[PDB]
Design an enzyme around this catalytic site. Sequence first.
Site, mmCIF file in Angstrom:
data_model
loop_
_atom_site.group_PDB
_atom_site.id
_atom_site.type_symbol
_atom_site.label_atom_id
_atom_site.label_comp_id
_atom_site.label_asym_id
_atom_site.label_seq_id
_atom_site.Cartn_x
_atom_site.Cartn_y
_atom_site.Cartn_z
ATOM 1 N N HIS A 16 12.441 100.291 55.960
ATOM 2 C CA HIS A 16 11.594 99.377 56.724
ATOM 3 C C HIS A 16 12.008 97.926 56.470
ATOM 4 C CE1 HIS A 16 8.880 102.300 58.414
ATOM 5 N NE2 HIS A 16 8.290 102.674 57.289
ATOM 6 N N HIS A 61 12.606 105.031 51.510
ATOM 7 C CA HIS A 61 11.921 104.919 52.796
ATOM 8 C C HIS A 61 11.495 103.467 53.033
ATOM 9 C CE1 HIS A 61 9.041 106.437 56.017
ATOM 10 N NE2 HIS A 61 8.479 105.264 55.770
ATOM 11 N N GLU A 62 10.818 102.866 52.052
ATOM 12 C CA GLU A 62 10.355 101.482 52.169
ATOM 13 C C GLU A 62 11.503 100.513 52.429
ATOM 14 O OE1 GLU A 62 7.038 100.981 52.474
ATOM 15 O OE2 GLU A 62 7.115 103.151 52.231
ATOM 16 N N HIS A 119 10.011 104.432 62.211
ATOM 17 C CA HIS A 119 9.960 105.840 61.845
ATOM 18 C C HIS A 119 10.749 106.739 62.793
ATOM 19 C CE1 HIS A 119 6.158 104.945 59.331
ATOM 20 N NE2 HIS A 119 7.185 105.047 58.505
HETATM 21 C C1 L04 Z 1 6.480 111.083 64.155
HETATM 22 C C2 L04 Z 1 6.078 110.567 65.525
HETATM 23 C C3 L04 Z 1 7.311 110.160 66.332
HETATM 24 C C4 L04 Z 1 5.294 111.668 66.243
HETATM 25 C C5 L04 Z 1 4.875 111.434 67.696
HETATM 26 N N1 L04 Z 1 4.041 110.246 67.811
HETATM 27 C C6 L04 Z 1 4.157 109.423 68.848
HETATM 28 O O1 L04 Z 1 4.980 109.587 69.752
HETATM 29 C C7 L04 Z 1 3.199 108.240 68.867
HETATM 30 C C8 L04 Z 1 1.832 108.732 69.351
HETATM 31 C C9 L04 Z 1 0.730 107.716 69.209
HETATM 32 C C10 L04 Z 1 -0.655 108.286 69.218
HETATM 33 C C11 L04 Z 1 -1.230 108.760 68.044
HETATM 34 C C12 L04 Z 1 -2.525 109.257 68.039
HETATM 35 C C13 L04 Z 1 -3.268 109.292 69.213
HETATM 36 C C14 L04 Z 1 -4.644 109.815 69.225
HETATM 37 C C15 L04 Z 1 -5.019 110.789 70.143
HETATM 38 C C16 L04 Z 1 -6.319 111.277 70.163
HETATM 39 C C17 L04 Z 1 -7.267 110.802 69.269
HETATM 40 F F1 L04 Z 1 -8.531 111.273 69.308
HETATM 41 C C18 L04 Z 1 -6.894 109.841 68.339
HETATM 42 C C19 L04 Z 1 -5.594 109.346 68.323
HETATM 43 C C20 L04 Z 1 -2.688 108.820 70.386
HETATM 44 C C21 L04 Z 1 -1.398 108.324 70.389
HETATM 45 C C22 L04 Z 1 3.735 107.130 69.770
HETATM 46 C C23 L04 Z 1 4.455 105.973 69.073
HETATM 47 C C24 L04 Z 1 5.584 106.434 68.140
HETATM 48 C C25 L04 Z 1 6.418 105.303 67.561
HETATM 49 C C26 L04 Z 1 7.598 105.840 66.763
HETATM 50 C C27 L04 Z 1 8.268 104.747 65.943
HETATM 51 N N2 L04 Z 1 8.769 103.640 66.756
HETATM 52 C C28 L04 Z 1 10.021 103.570 67.519
HETATM 53 C C29 L04 Z 1 9.909 102.205 68.195
HETATM 54 C C30 L04 Z 1 10.740 101.558 69.118
HETATM 55 C C31 L04 Z 1 10.375 100.306 69.607
HETATM 56 C C32 L04 Z 1 9.204 99.697 69.191
HETATM 57 C C33 L04 Z 1 8.366 100.316 68.276
HETATM 58 C C34 L04 Z 1 8.710 101.578 67.770
HETATM 59 C C35 L04 Z 1 8.039 102.502 66.847
HETATM 60 O O2 L04 Z 1 6.964 102.294 66.280
HETATM 61 C C36 L04 Z 1 3.436 105.088 68.346
HETATM 62 O O3 L04 Z 1 3.030 105.309 67.176
HETATM 63 O O4 L04 Z 1 2.971 104.133 68.975
HETATM 64 C C37 L04 Z 1 4.054 112.618 68.193
HETATM 65 O O5 L04 Z 1 2.898 112.784 67.794
HETATM 66 N N3 L04 Z 1 4.637 113.385 69.115
HETATM 67 C C38 L04 Z 1 4.140 114.517 69.731
HETATM 68 C C39 L04 Z 1 2.863 115.027 69.499
HETATM 69 C C40 L04 Z 1 2.426 116.180 70.147
HETATM 70 C C41 L04 Z 1 3.270 116.836 71.042
HETATM 71 C C42 L04 Z 1 4.546 116.337 71.280
HETATM 72 C C43 L04 Z 1 4.973 115.184 70.628
HETATM 73 C C1 L04 Z 2 -0.484 108.304 57.818
HETATM 74 C C2 L04 Z 2 0.216 107.705 56.610
HETATM 75 C C3 L04 Z 2 -0.600 106.550 56.030
HETATM 76 C C4 L04 Z 2 0.411 108.811 55.570
HETATM 77 C C5 L04 Z 2 0.994 108.433 54.207
HETATM 78 N N1 L04 Z 2 2.307 107.822 54.353
HETATM 79 C C6 L04 Z 2 2.682 106.805 53.585
HETATM 80 O O1 L04 Z 2 1.950 106.298 52.731
HETATM 81 C C7 L04 Z 2 4.093 106.284 53.815
HETATM 82 C C8 L04 Z 2 5.077 107.231 53.121
HETATM 83 C C9 L04 Z 2 6.521 106.963 53.449
HETATM 84 C C10 L04 Z 2 7.448 108.110 53.191
HETATM 85 C C11 L04 Z 2 7.634 109.098 54.151
HETATM 86 C C12 L04 Z 2 8.518 110.145 53.931
HETATM 87 C C13 L04 Z 2 9.231 110.223 52.741
HETATM 88 C C14 L04 Z 2 10.173 111.325 52.492
HETATM 89 C C15 L04 Z 2 10.090 112.073 51.323
HETATM 90 C C16 L04 Z 2 10.983 113.108 51.082
HETATM 91 C C17 L04 Z 2 11.976 113.415 52.000
HETATM 92 F F1 L04 Z 2 12.849 114.412 51.746
HETATM 93 C C18 L04 Z 2 12.055 112.682 53.176
HETATM 94 C C19 L04 Z 2 11.164 111.640 53.416
HETATM 95 C C20 L04 Z 2 9.039 109.234 51.780
HETATM 96 C C21 L04 Z 2 8.159 108.192 52.002
HETATM 97 C C22 L04 Z 2 4.233 104.859 53.281
HETATM 98 C C23 L04 Z 2 4.122 103.733 54.311
HETATM 99 C C24 L04 Z 2 2.849 103.814 55.165
HETATM 100 C C25 L04 Z 2 2.634 102.621 56.082
HETATM 101 C C26 L04 Z 2 1.289 102.704 56.790
HETATM 102 C C27 L04 Z 2 1.181 101.688 57.918
HETATM 103 N N2 L04 Z 2 1.343 100.307 57.467
HETATM 104 C C28 L04 Z 2 0.342 99.434 56.841
HETATM 105 C C29 L04 Z 2 1.154 98.174 56.548
HETATM 106 C C30 L04 Z 2 0.812 96.984 55.892
HETATM 107 C C31 L04 Z 2 1.776 95.992 55.731
HETATM 108 C C32 L04 Z 2 3.063 96.168 56.210
HETATM 109 C C33 L04 Z 2 3.424 97.335 56.864
HETATM 110 C C34 L04 Z 2 2.473 98.351 57.039
HETATM 111 C C35 L04 Z 2 2.540 99.693 57.631
HETATM 112 O O2 L04 Z 2 3.536 100.197 58.156
HETATM 113 C C36 L04 Z 2 5.389 103.688 55.173
HETATM 114 O O3 L04 Z 2 5.550 104.383 56.210
HETATM 115 O O4 L04 Z 2 6.304 102.955 54.791
HETATM 116 C C37 L04 Z 2 1.166 109.685 53.354
HETATM 117 O O5 L04 Z 2 2.062 110.494 53.612
HETATM 118 N N3 L04 Z 2 0.349 109.793 52.306
HETATM 119 C C38 L04 Z 2 0.273 110.812 51.376
HETATM 120 C C39 L04 Z 2 1.119 111.920 51.372
HETATM 121 C C40 L04 Z 2 0.982 112.919 50.410
HETATM 122 C C41 L04 Z 2 -0.009 112.813 49.435
HETATM 123 C C42 L04 Z 2 -0.858 111.713 49.430
HETATM 124 C C43 L04 Z 2 -0.713 110.720 50.395
HETATM 125 ZN ZN ZN Z 3 7.275 104.257 56.840
#
Ligand code: L04
Ligand code: L04
Ligand code: ZN
Lengths: 160, 160
Positions: A118, A114-115, A124
Site C-alpha cells: 500500500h 502487505h502494508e 487490493h
Molecule cells: C476482494 C474484492 C475485489 C472482492 C469484490 N469486491 C468488489 O468488487 C467491491 C464491492 C464493493 C461492495 C461491498 C459491499 C457492498 C454491500 C452490499 C450489501 C450490503 F448490505 C452491504 C454492503 C456493496 C459493494 C468493489 C470495489 C473493489 C475495489 C478493489 C480494489 N481497487 C482497485 C482500484 C482501481 C482504481 C481505483 C480504486 C481501486 C480499488 O479500490 C470497492 O471496494 O469499491 C467482490 O466482492 N466481488 C464479488 C462478490 C460477489 C460475486 C462476485 C464478485
Molecule cells: C475487512 C478488513 C478490515 C479485515 C482485516 N484486514 C486487515 O486488517 C488488513 C490485513 C492485510 C493483509 C491481508 C492479507 C495478508 C496475507 C497473508 C498471508 C498470505 F499468504 C497472503 C496475504 C496479509 C495482510 C490490514 C489493512 C486494513 C485496512 C482497512 C481500511 N483502511 C483504514 C485506513 C486508515 C488509514 C489509512 C488507510 C486505511 C485503510 O485502508 C490493509 O488492508 O492494509 C482482517 O483480515 N482482520 C483480521 C483477520 C484475521 C483475524 C483477525 C482480524
Molecule cells: Zn490492504
Amino acid sequence: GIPKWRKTHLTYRIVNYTPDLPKDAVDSAVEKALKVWEEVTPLTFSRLYEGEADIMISFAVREHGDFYPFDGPGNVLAHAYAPGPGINGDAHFDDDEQWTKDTTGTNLFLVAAHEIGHSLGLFHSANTEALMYPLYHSLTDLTRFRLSQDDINGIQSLYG
Amino acid sequence: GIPKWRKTHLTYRIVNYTPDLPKDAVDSAVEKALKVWEEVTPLTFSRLYEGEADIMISFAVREHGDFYPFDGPGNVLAHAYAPGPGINGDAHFDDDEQWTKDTTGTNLFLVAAHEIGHSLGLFHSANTEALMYPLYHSLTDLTRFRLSQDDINGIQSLYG
Ligand SMILES: CC(C)C[C@H](NC(=O)[C@H](CCc1ccc(-c2ccc(F)cc2)cc1)C[C@H](CCCCN1Cc2ccccc2C1=O)C(=O)O)C(=O)Nc1ccccc1
Ligand SMILES: CC(C)C[C@H](NC(=O)[C@H](CCc1ccc(-c2ccc(F)cc2)cc1)C[C@H](CCCCN1Cc2ccccc2C1=O)C(=O)O)C(=O)Nc1ccccc1
Ligand SMILES: [Zn+2]
Ligand SMILES: [Ca+2]
Ligand SMILES: [Ca+2]
Ligand SMILES: [Ca+2]
Ligand SMILES: [Ca+2]
Ligand SMILES: [Ca+2]
Ligand SMILES: [Ca+2]
Ligand SMILES: [Zn+2]
Ligand SMILES: [Zn+2]
Ligand SMILES: [Zn+2]
C-alpha cells in the site's frame, strides 16, 4: 491519477518497537518484507535511525496521532498510506494484536509485506491467494509464501 | 492527510448507461445511492447532463481509459477514486457484470452506494454488516438495508 513515488530510492525508519517480539525479530520481519518488493522492482530501501524517512513504521494502539484510531484486538490489524509527503507512505501496526514471527497469531512479516504494498501505491487484489487480498489469513507453512502473479504485475506496472 | 472534498455541494453526471437495465432504473439507483449519504451529512448533489461533473459515473468493460482495466464477469465489480480533480471522485462500474435492481445478480444501488462512499473519501470498514465492508453480498430483502453506525460515524467525521 496513478499514486506512486517519483523516486526509486526510498528510506524507512522503524520509529518504535512492539514488546511482542525481540528487537532483532522486528528488524528481520521488516527487512524481509521490503526484500519481497526489491526482488521484483528496481526499488531499493535504506534505513534511517533518526528524523523523518519516507516510510515511517510504527506500532500503536487506539488513538495514535492520526485521523484513524485503532480498534483493539482483531478487526483492523494495521493501516498504511499511499505515496506522498508527510504521513503519506507511512505504515502503522495495531499493537493490540499479538505480533508473531511464526504461523500462529498475527504474523508480522506477512502483514508488513502487505502494508508496504500500500505504501508503494498498490490497491487490493481479487485473487484470494495474492498478498494484496483484503483479508488476512495465516499460512500452514511460511515457506509456502510467494507473491502471486497479480502482485508482481501490479507493482511492475507502477515501477518496472 | 484526510482526503475529502473542500466543498459540500457536489455535481455528478451519468456519462453513459448499462444495457442491463432501463434508463429510468439506472437514474433511480444512482439517485437513491446519493440520498443515502445526503441523509446523514450536510452534502447535496446536483446532476449535470454535459461536460465534467465532480463525480463522473460510467459503465465500462476491460480497458476503459484509466490505469486499472476491468476483469470480466465476477471479481472486481467496480472502482471509485478518492476526492480530488479530474479522474478523482469518479466511479466506474464493470459492465461485464449483470446489473440488477433486485436481490439477484449484482444490485446496482448497493454497489453504487458503496462506490460513492469511496468517492467521498471513505475507506473500508471491518464490520461485516457495514455498507463499506470490502466484499459484496446480496440481501434477502432490499428493505432490510441501512447504513451501519460505522458508516455514519465515518462519513460524519469527514463532513458533519
Ligand atoms: C476482494 C474484492 C475485489 C472482492 C469484490 N469486491 C468488489 O468488487 C467491491 C464491492 C464493493 C461492495 C461491498 C459491499 C457492498 C454491500 C452490499 C450489501 C450490503 F448490505 C452491504 C454492503 C456493496 C459493494 C468493489 C470495489 C473493489 C475495489 C478493489 C480494489 N481497487 C482497485 C482500484 C482501481 C482504481 C481505483 C480504486 C481501486 C480499488 O479500490 C470497492 O471496494 O469499491 C467482490 O466482492 N466481488 C464479488 C462478490 C460477489 C460475486 C462476485 C464478485
Ligand atoms: C475487512 C478488513 C478490515 C479485515 C482485516 N484486514 C486487515 O486488517 C488488513 C490485513 C492485510 C493483509 C491481508 C492479507 C495478508 C496475507 C497473508 C498471508 C498470505 F499468504 C497472503 C496475504 C496479509 C495482510 C490490514 C489493512 C486494513 C485496512 C482497512 C481500511 N483502511 C483504514 C485506513 C486508515 C488509514 C489509512 C488507510 C486505511 C485503510 O485502508 C490493509 O488492508 O492494509 C482482517 O483480515 N482482520 C483480521 C483477520 C484475521 C483475524 C483477525 C482480524
Ligand atoms: Zn490492504
Ligand atoms: Ca511518509
Ligand atoms: Ca485491531
Ligand atoms: Ca501487541
Ligand atoms: Ca472527478
Ligand atoms: Ca468484474
Ligand atoms: Ca452488463
Ligand atoms: Zn495510524
Ligand atoms: Zn476505471
Ligand atoms: Zn470498496
